[PDB]
Subunit: 125 residues, 4 copies
């Protein structure tokens, strides 16, 4: 399994998405851990032109706080959907902006696990 | 010509971008005001796949706090660039998600002014 | 008051969208005119991460043919919707890559009219 | 090794990017094969709001021709850079719109090989 700090991200993201009204525009929450120990959250902004996924809003929120490197991140869907693997675009942005980051996804056993971003983007660009 | 609240937005966004390390990835900050009086900030996340502009990070931050309708927004560039009009993509997202919002831009005389989002997208899609 | 070539763009985009199966992923066609006289077409690719609008596929198609500067562009929707004004994102990309381009939109009387891209993005970023 | 159609795609994409002026806006070409016997090309349209990668332009070009299903795709960088693996966003769009497609990438030996899109996006969204 994952460490307690990483497990805290799941709780924080879950709390964030479940604390707001059900919406088709804001349906996913994300939480990331910075190298200094702070946690940053955010929800997605859906739009056909490429509204940011929750993870990208988190990256912007962390940057606004001069958080520096982010070490772990997770996305939680609304309506008790739980952990959601980051989409291809988010994986690319994470790899390019925080190459040392790990994302929390569900393994074959459906259990939470933190994986290096490069593993989610083999032969990545 | 701006209200007290609007001037505060400019100050908040300016302080945000000036407070972080100069970066090519995080170079613009934005601040928005919600109908309930709360202010939300954020900085952009640059990426060729369409990393969110500061305004979009602000929309997700506001949504994460269940801010509801946003009434005004502004973007401030790093290196003392001052007010920057929202780009075309942000105008579209703002129009679609917060149709009653205004954006602070510089008028033909270089003076800050709050304009209805529809005015920034004539014959908008 | 559209030129012969401008009206031809409308015909070409209309023919394109009426030549493919009705789809929720590919619902808009676009056609643009190059200064060298050639016409390029395209259809959008819908995706939440920001799949390109028909106009952007056209820009990439024109680029692949070494078209150079485009002078006019139009978007035609399926379901017999007719002319669609470019969305905010397309306006920004068009302004940044083809600043002298015009986009065909509907005037107050619902008739086709070519408008400078700068007019579609007042006080543009 | 690569099949005949796979080597042909590389040649077509390579010829495409090498046939246009060197540009920072149009720097990658892509080519895809459709199940109905056609090959579609395209070049990227760089833009901070998420201008489409060459692969997305190809998808819209194929869609405009009512191509249906794309079975293989490849991207070639300008300035003799050769094969470029699809970025994360492209992998997501490809997986969602053409789940049965294969993408040509370089293996650990620098040797080109066609791989199922799902393989490039482990535990995708
Ligand atoms: C799981 As997601 C769509 O926030 O990359
Ligand atoms: C002024 As902007 C680049 O944050 O849309
Ligand atoms: C009118 As459009 C959605 O092709 O920018
Ligand atoms: C290698 As690409 C940037 O055309 O996904
Ligand atoms: Zn994502
Ligand atoms: Zn913007
Ligand atoms: Zn558009
Ligand atoms: Zn790509």
């Amino acid at each position: 399994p994952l460490s307690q700090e990483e497990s805290t991200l799941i709780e924080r993201a879950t709390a964030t998405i479940n604390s707001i009204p059900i919406s088709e525009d804001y349906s996913v929450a994300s939480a990331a851990l910075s190298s200094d120990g702070r946690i940053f959250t955010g929800v997605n902004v859906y739009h056909f032109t490429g509204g940011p996924c929750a993870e990208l809003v988190v990256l912007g929120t962390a940057a606004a706080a001069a958080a520096g490197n982010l070490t772990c991140i997770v996305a939680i869907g609304n309506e008790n959907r739980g952990i959601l693997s980051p989409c291809g675009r988010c994986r690319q942005v994470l790899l390019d902006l925080h190459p040392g980051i790990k994302a929390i996804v569900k393994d074959s056993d459906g259990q939470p696990t933190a994986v290096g971003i490069r593993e989610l983007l083999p032969s990545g660009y």
